[PDB]
Amino acid sequence: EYKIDETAQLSTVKNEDGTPVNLFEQDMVALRATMHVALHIADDKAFAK
Amino acid sequence: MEGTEKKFTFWADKPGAYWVGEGQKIETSKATWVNATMRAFKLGVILPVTKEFLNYTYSQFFEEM
Amino acid sequence: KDGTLMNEFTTPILQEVMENSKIMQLGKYEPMEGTEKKFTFWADKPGAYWVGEGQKIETSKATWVNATMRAFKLGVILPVTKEFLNYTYSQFFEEMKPMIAEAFYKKFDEAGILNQGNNPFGKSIAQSIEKTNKVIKGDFTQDNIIDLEALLEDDELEANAFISKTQNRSLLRKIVDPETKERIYDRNSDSLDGLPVVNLKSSNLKRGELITGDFDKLIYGIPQLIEYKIDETAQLSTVKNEDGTPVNLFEQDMVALRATMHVALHIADDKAFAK
């Protein structure tokens, strides 16, 4: 179950101004990841003379 | 059940174009009050009842009445 | 609200007549979207030792229509409080689905034959009859009915049975034929000429019978869907007045079943004259 805040207009039937619909249309996503830094990394970058 | 009980339900027709689901259902109830009572025997059967106790033929007539 | 209990609901001997009329029409159904027509009419030359005129006409016609059953609002709002208290309302909802399905077939027939709705729009039996102008003015006579039936068979394909609108059938039964035979009299089944006539209730149509044979009728499937989240508000009363439908589960389930119908133009119908 997912709710939309943008409320985009649809081609079929009359367009709705109000946010979120009862019928399923948008897919929910749940993923969490945290990264730790070692404070030591090599890097290379190009610079104009 | 005592008296009378009747129930009626009506459904509403839905729109052609798909946009919103229409509901609203009609309901009706019917009930009747007061029942008629049977009339009791009076002086007419009372004259025959005295003959029923004495005569055997009049006793069978009381049951048929 | 929900004070006195009635414990009664209306069922059968009403929806069965509407379902029988739709089945009596007979039409081919297809699962694939769209349609196709066949090539007809080609020019031929009569002149000797010459090629002459040579042209063949090709025809192609696609048909697609989407239908959806409307959900209740006014009656459904009262039913929501009764459903939690009584178990009979849940059983009544299953019977209401059958009535809504019968109304779905009735709305498709009324849009074409009676021109009440805009379901079919282009392919309508009443619209085709108005364009061709085959309808007879005034009251239909016993001798006039036989002449109208013979005129349709000469120009187009012959129809099996004419459509009845309840009130029109009663007026036809009173009239008697010129020969020694009863006209429009039903001993066991009602028939106009041979085949059994179908009775259908219509708001627009009141007087006059229309005869049609060839008619296309296609359906996607069965009208059944689960109810979730409130949508489309019209009338609601329980504790506080609301303009837009929100909160809780849906009061009435909205059913979706697509239906499409194509007309070949065969109906003539009859209309009463006014002075």
UniProtKB/Swiss-Prot annotation, chain B:
Post-translationally, this protein is described as follows, namely:
The N-terminus is cleaved by ribosomal processing protease Prp.
Superkingdom, taxonomy of origin: Viruses
Q: Where in the cell is it found?
A: Virion
- Family designation: Belongs to the HK97 phage major capsid protein family.
**Subunit arrangement?**
Forms homopentamers and homohexamers in the mature capsid forming a 63 nm icosahedral head with T=7 architecture. The procapsid is made up of hexamers and pentamers of this subunit. There are seven subunits in the asymmetric unit in the T=7 procapsid. Found in the procapsid with the scaffold protein in a 2:1 capsid protein:scaffold protein molecular ratio.
| Job description of the protein | Assembles to form an icosahedral capsid, as well as procapsid, with T=7 icosahedral symmetry.
Q: What is this protein called?
A: Major capsid protein
From Swiss-Prot, chain C:
Taxonomically, which superkingdom?
A: Viruses
Q: Which GO CC annotations does the UniProt entry carry?
A: viral capsid
From the Swiss-Prot or TrEMBL record, state where the protein is found.
Answer: Virion
Modification after translation is described as: The N-terminus is cleaved by ribosomal processing protease Prp.
- Give the record's keywords alphabetically: Capsid protein, Late protein, Virion
What role is this protein assigned? Assembles to form an icosahedral capsid, as well as procapsid, with T=7 icosahedral symmetry.
Subunit note: Forms homopentamers and homohexamers in the mature capsid forming a 63 nm icosahedral head with T=7 architecture. The procapsid is made up of hexamers and pentamers of this subunit. There are seven subunits in the asymmetric unit in the T=7 procapsid. Found in the procapsid with the scaffold protein in a 2:1 capsid protein:scaffold protein molecular ratio.
Family note: Belongs to the HK97 phage major capsid protein family.
What name does the UniProt record give this protein? Answer: Major capsid protein
Give the organism, scientific name.
Staphylococcus phage 80alpha
What are the top taxonomic ranks of the organism?
Viruses, Duplodnaviria, Heunggongvirae, Uroviricota, Caudoviricetes
Query: What part of the entire protein does this chain span?
Result: 35 to 309 of 324
